[PDB]
């Protein structure tokens, strides 16, 4: 009906069809704190909202009023709750409401309430058929929107819509290989479909990641994904990894490659590798390089790591004090 931004918008206190209702002023007390000096339009809508809420008036006019209250403050979760009460009480068409929430999310996508509302609608309708395309449009504008990725995971998992998501992930990694949300989505998809224990899958994923590392050696996301998919089994379980990373040292180096080396060495020492001492000193040398030159922002972390490795892996570490 009358859009909040319409040139001919009129205050609720001036509307004939609201004449019967006394608006309800906010009760901030005799000496207010954090008192917001609301605009006229804002205070007018919310005075009327307080009135319909207080009376629990479940009417078409109250339903339309929630649209304005939401537009004025989409984070007002009380208004959203009442709007959902009205959707059910008035038996409103839920596909019309889906059209509404898609428009609102498009304009204010960084808001918890709007995404939760959309989830409730999808649950009520048991219809996920618009979701992936809708979310894709939001991600086309902000490829890192946290709520959008979260809703996407919920939709995929709840409705088992796994079949095309790896393809979607590959598309987004092509657009921006530094997009960490997308690396996260890659792990989410693989973990819940094939899993990473399938050797062919793990192999494919490591080769792919190494290929991205070669293309963009300072991209931290690829480095974190490589570590993430290997670390629970233990980096030292993969003896070829070390040599192959050392082979990137010359013209593909980074503080990330160096840090990964330390992580490889750390696991080796934990699993009683050959040449305990040789490995230790290699690791300590690297920790020092990182702390003093290559990654000084993390000097406290790297000194802590060097200290930890020394404390438990030095030849003297298991030697009784009397010796």
């Amino acid at each position: 009906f009358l859009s909040l931004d319409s040139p001919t918008y009129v205050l609720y206190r001036d509307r004939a069809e609201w004449a019967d209702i006394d608006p309800v002023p906010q009760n901030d007390g005799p000496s207010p704190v954090v008192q917001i000096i609301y605009s006229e339009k804002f205070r007018d809508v919310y005075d009327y909202f307080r009135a319909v809420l207080q009376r629990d008036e479940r009417s078409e006019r109250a339903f339309k009023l929630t649209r304005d209250a939401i537009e004025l403050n989409a984070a007002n979760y009380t208004v959203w709750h009442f709007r959902r009460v009205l959707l059910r009480s008035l038996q409103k068409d839920l596909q019309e409401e889906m059209n509404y929430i898609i428009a609102i999310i498009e304009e204010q996508p960084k808001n918890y309430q709007v995404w939760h509302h959309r989830r409730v609608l999808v649950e009520w309708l048991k219809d996920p058929s618009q979701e992936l395309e809708f979310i894709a449009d939001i991600l086309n504008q902000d490829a890192k929107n946290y709520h959008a990725w979260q809703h996407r995971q919920w939709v995929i998992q709840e409705f088992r819509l796994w079949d095309n998501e790896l393809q979607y992930v590959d598309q987004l990694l092509k657009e921006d290989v530094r997009n960490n949300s997308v690396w996260n989505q890659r792990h989410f998809v693989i973990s819940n479909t094939t899993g990473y224990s399938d050797r062919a899958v793990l192999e494919r994923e490591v080769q792919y990641t190494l290929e991205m590392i070669k293309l963009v050696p300072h991209n931290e996301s690829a480095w974190n994904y490589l570590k993430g998919i290997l670390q629970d089994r233990g980096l030292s379980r993969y003896p070829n990894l070390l040599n192959q990373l050392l082979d990137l040292q010359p013209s593909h180096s980074s503080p990330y490659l160096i840090a990964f080396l330390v992580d490889i060495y750390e696991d080796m020492l934990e699993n009683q590798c050959d040449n305990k001492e040789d490995i230790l000193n290699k690791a300590l040398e690297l920790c020092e390089i990182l702390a003093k030159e290559k990654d000084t922002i993390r000097k406290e972390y790297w000194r802590y790591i060097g200290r930890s490795l020394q404390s438990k892996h030095s030849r003297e570490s298991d030697i009784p004090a009397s010796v």
Partner: protein, 407 residues
């Protein structure tokens, strides 16, 4: 030496910390480069203006901004009309950090307003007449604890609060943020925080909650909002802090968490990003850097022998430099990054993070690092609740005089 620059961000080597994009441009690298150029201008402004750098926390300006906001806000704050207890908390905490006393007149007015925000069925809403919600409930309880008077403590209906928490509890261990609302790790933290402060924790209230939080830790080492989601500083703080309250930090892989958080400090800017490959933001000075004290305490309780006894495991100096040089509005208030506007939320968390960066404490051991003028030093904050540690102790002691509702 005379040629030596005492500020880490102004040293000549620091230029080597600029982004290397490997000649492959994407939206991510373009955006990072834009921030770095703006920050470099800030860093170099002294040199180009031929002045000696002096890092001063603009206390009087911040106090004026806070004192007024505690009473009245412009319509710029309409979007926070359902978060008024957060405004009370952010402002009162900032004032506490700045060691500015709270007039009893103000204290009593805050108490009375929060009473009006309290629901008959327990918890606090975003404003008077609003349904209760765990976020303003957390804020309201923190604010009342910062005030710390008998009147303030008495505002909280403890019996109804517990009932409210039970009404939000889910079978999988998680909590709804509010009735008919969303679930994420924020709710676990909000619930743990208010229940522990007010001594209403029953034997089964948090059954399954530690395990649910641990499922939110992912392949990155940090914690996402729900299981499966990308690791983020805000959710990671909520997850670890709730586990500390529950005495269940060991449920997490603390080592992968430590590696993840330390990697979130930006080598050039000195501040922290909220997740991998996104931008620095002053409020993560708290959410991210606040994890380091939590991890220190946790690792120490495990008898970790290699822990520093004077510093947190992040660059305390670089963080203070970022906050002092980049995050202050000359008119008063702090902000996200240069070019953004001041707001009470960033004022709260930038100062909270500055305090953490200034103060190391591990039992008997204490060490301060105060960059810039000595008057820059803030009051310490408790890394779990983010109110003064004195206020935490005083509140917990007071409520322990009461029995857990139901006995």
């Amino acid at each position: 030496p005379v040629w030596s620059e005492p500020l880490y961000s102004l040293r000549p080597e620091h230029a080597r910390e600029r982004l290397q994009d490997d000649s492959v441009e994407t939206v991510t690298s373009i955006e990072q480069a834009k921030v770095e150029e703006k920050i470099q201008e800030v860093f170099s402004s002294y040199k180009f203006n031929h002045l000696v750098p002096r890092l001063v926390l603009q206390r009087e300006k911040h106090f004026h901004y806070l004192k007024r906001g505690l009473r009245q806000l412009t319509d710029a704050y309409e979007c926070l009309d359902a978060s008024r207890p957060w405004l009370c908390y952010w402002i009162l905490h900032s004032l506490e950090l700045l060691d500015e006393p709270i007039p009893q007149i103000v204290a009593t007015d805050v108490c009375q307003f929060l009473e009006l925000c309290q629901s008959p069925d327990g918890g606090f809403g975003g404003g008077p007449g609003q349904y209760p919600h765990l976020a303003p409930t957390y804020a309201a309880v923190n604010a009342l604890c910062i005030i710390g008077t008998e009147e303030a403590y008495n505002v909280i209906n403890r019996e109804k609060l517990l009932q409210y928490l039970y009404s939000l509890k889910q079978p999988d261990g998680s909590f709804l943020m509010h009735v008919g609302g969303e679930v994420d790790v924020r709710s676990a933290y909000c619930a743990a925080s208010v229940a522990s402060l007010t001594n209403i924790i029953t034997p089964d209230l948090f059954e399954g909650t530690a395990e649910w939080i641990a499922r939110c830790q992912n392949w990155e080492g940090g914690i996402g909002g729900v299981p499966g989601m990308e690791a983020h500083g805000g959710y990671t703080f909520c997850g670890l802090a709730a586990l500390v309250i529950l005495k269940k930090e060991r449920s997490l892989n603390l080592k992968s968490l430590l590696q993840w958080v330390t990697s979130r400090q930006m080598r050039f800017e000195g501040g922290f990003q909220g997740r991998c490959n996104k931008l620095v933001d002053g409020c993560y000075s708290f959410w991210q850097a606040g994890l380091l004290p939590l991890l220190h305490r946790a690792l120490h309780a495990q008898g970790d022998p290699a822990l520093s006894m004077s510093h947190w495991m992040f660059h305390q100096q670089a963080l203070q430099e970022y906050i002092l040089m980049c995050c202050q509005c000359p008119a008063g208030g702090l902000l996200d990054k240069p070019g953004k506007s001041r707001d009470f939320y960033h004022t709260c968390y930038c100062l909270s993070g500055l305090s953490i960066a200034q103060h190391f404490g591990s039992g008997a051991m204490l060490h301060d690092v105060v960059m810039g003028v000595p008057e820059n030093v803030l009051q310490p904050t408790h890394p779990v609740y983010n109110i003064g540690p004195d206020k935490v102790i005083q509140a917990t002691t007071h409520f322990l005089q009461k029995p857990v509702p139901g006995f």
